[PDB]
RNA sequence: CGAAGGUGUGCUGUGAGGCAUGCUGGAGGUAUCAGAAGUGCGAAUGCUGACAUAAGUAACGAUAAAGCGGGUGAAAAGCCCGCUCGCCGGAAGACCAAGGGUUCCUGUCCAACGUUAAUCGGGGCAGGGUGAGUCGACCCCUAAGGCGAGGCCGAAAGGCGU
RNA sequence: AGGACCGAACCGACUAAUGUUGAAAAAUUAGCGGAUGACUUGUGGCUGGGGGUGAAAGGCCAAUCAAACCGGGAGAUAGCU
RNA sequence: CCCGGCGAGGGGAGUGAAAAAGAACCUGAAACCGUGUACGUACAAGCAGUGGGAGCACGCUUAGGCGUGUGACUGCGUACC
RNA sequence: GGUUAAGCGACUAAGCGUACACGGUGGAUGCCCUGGCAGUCAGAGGCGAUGAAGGACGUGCUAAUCUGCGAUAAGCGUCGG
């Protein structure tokens, strides 16, 4: 009855909230905004922020790892390479969430999320 | 289950008397534009705490 | 001739709904509720015609009671002295006596307890 | 001046629009609308378009004051409605309706 | 489930059809009635 | 200079009722006395139309699954493009018969339909699209069977059959 | 060789659950029987109501059957409501 | 002409005797659904009315305890066919 | 005039109830009829292999339907008003 308990589970299984994560984590970091939902935004960082945490220390088991996580090469190109510096002296807090109101098709609590700087 | 008498009009009125809306009052005032929108939330052309956060 | 009884019936419905206007809910806008409100209206209004006068007189020998026990007499004391001394005077006149003018119905209680002796 | 506009034939149930228009009945203007766009409901959206319209309606018809515009009168009524064929279990057949509403907004200075 | 109208539209001219109609004495009768009663569509075909 | 009808008020009769008038209505109504009824509704699990209730409740139709960026657009979870994720893959792929009868493509729109949004659609409107000596049909022949000149039989209708 | 065996397509419907204003006017899921024969299926044809057909349940004969459906006798009759 | 999506819908201007005749178009009742006003109702139990009845609001009247609207409380009262 | 105590006490309506006014849905009522029903007086009481009744498809400056017409296709020739 959640007692202590953390982790939400957004009407969906173990193996579509993985993917969907997976997918979104890679999407995030490719274009450093993403427009999603307020559940999702909270959940994501739970999953990109350990991500780029991992990311700081560059070696080839670190990318191997990193490379089971979004199961994408060019994502984890992108990672030790350009989010690595960026974030080297930075301890946690990677993201924040940008509330946008709901949306017209089925009112939800609608926010994006972007990294720190961005560089932009 | 169903009914055996017709409910009237007051009976149905006093059970929607607690299905009034609740109307916002007091959203916010922007810093920088000064116009309306949510708490802690940006505006309509993406302005939070003053400093842009979209960039369009 | 075929004849159109739309304009009859109308009128009928109208009058009896004159007659119910403003009991509660249906009973005011319904015609097979409000007609059926309308009689028992009617016999009430007969039951009661009658109930009035009862329930009057109930209220008048109640007051003129009050008013003779203040002055240390039983009502029935009182109305069998009054009935000795040959007054004829009813009890709503008397109950109206007995609240207005207080001097009045002590002039009709020593009258009584002197012709009751 | 009394400022009247209404919009007829809106495709929304009379209890739903409803239970917008008391949240902005008798309110100054400059609020009202803040409620309603900032109103999560179909019908909020409706709504603010009449009240829109009347808007440009007691300027481009009526003098001045936007300012002190307020408005005074508003109800939405049941308007005709469509009757639609619904299938149900074991071939029987439910009369589905679709109700239509008048929202009536009147504005005025005064 | 196999509902009772298969449609087959050899059958239904060869069952129903104007030909099939007048190859009858009764058949002539009910080609009566239909035109008596004016109908647009006297029988099945086309 | 305001008929019928509708909607209120007042007066009046033992009652069904009657009269006057305010407003709406915008063209017929009808005294008195007689005559003829499709002549008076609250019920018949009455019939037809309209509108309530449950109630803004159940439900929104296989637990194969969505996420993001850009674009059009007034508005994008549903439309288009691209990247992923998942599903079928002796099918949820491809080609036909039967059936359907323009649902096919393009342009344009969201009145009604799509169990929601709609810019989308098998929706509305307009235009276009089906090219055979060799495919199929048509055509030659025939099975089961149908019809049937003469014929036999049967009140008639008609039945059988060369 | 088999009216043989296990088991797909296919045919059927024994058990359980769901569904019971359902996705469905008998279905879905998990199981189940037959599955080279007394098998199944496509197309066309024939048997018509006191009749047809029936490995026979008075079962089926257009979501119906101890006498189908439509029209007519017909405004049948009802000591009943 | 304006709002509105180059919509729907609406408001002006104008025609018209009338647009309270706008094509959903003569007259436009009732059930049903609302807006505003007047009164009552959050310690009171039931065919919801009836008899009494304070109070409150409006028209009276030029006073005269009148009428209309509601009905705190109270006796009686278990719908129709 | 102040403190304390005791007693009494309206003004609140989230909503609802009653009356009135103003509206919506609804299409009853009133009025009307190039529509029906029943008759009276007359005609006709049949059409067709010289191809009937009834239909399909075409025919206009035509996209559809109704009506008429039939590749001479909302029609052609002659004789009259
Ligand atoms: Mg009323």
Known sequence: ?120 | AVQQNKPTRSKRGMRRSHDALTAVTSLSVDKTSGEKHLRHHITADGYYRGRKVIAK | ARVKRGVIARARHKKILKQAKGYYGARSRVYRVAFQAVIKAGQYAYRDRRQRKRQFRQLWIARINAAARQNGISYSKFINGLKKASVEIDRKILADIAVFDKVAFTALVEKAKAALA | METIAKHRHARSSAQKVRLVADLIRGKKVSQALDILTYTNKKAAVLVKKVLESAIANAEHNDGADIDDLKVTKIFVDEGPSMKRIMPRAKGRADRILKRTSHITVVVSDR | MKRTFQPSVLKRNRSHGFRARMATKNGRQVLARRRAKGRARLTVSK
């Open chain 1, 1 to 120: 009855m959640r007692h202590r308990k953390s982790g939400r589970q957004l009407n969906r299984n173990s193996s579509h909230r993985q993917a969907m994560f997976r997918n979104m984590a890679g999407s995030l970091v490719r274009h450093e905004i993403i427009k999603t939902t307020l559940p999702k935004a909270k959940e994501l960082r739970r999953v990109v922020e350990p991500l780029i945490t991992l990311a700081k220390t560059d070696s080839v088991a670190n990318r191997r790892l990193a490379f089971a996580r979004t199961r994408d090469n060019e994502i984890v190109a992108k990672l030790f390479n350009e989010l690595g510096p960026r974030f080297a002296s930075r301890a946690g807090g990677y993201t924040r969430i940008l509330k946008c109101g709901f949306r017209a098709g089925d009112n939800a609590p609608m926010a994006y999320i972007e990294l720190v700087d961005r560089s932009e």
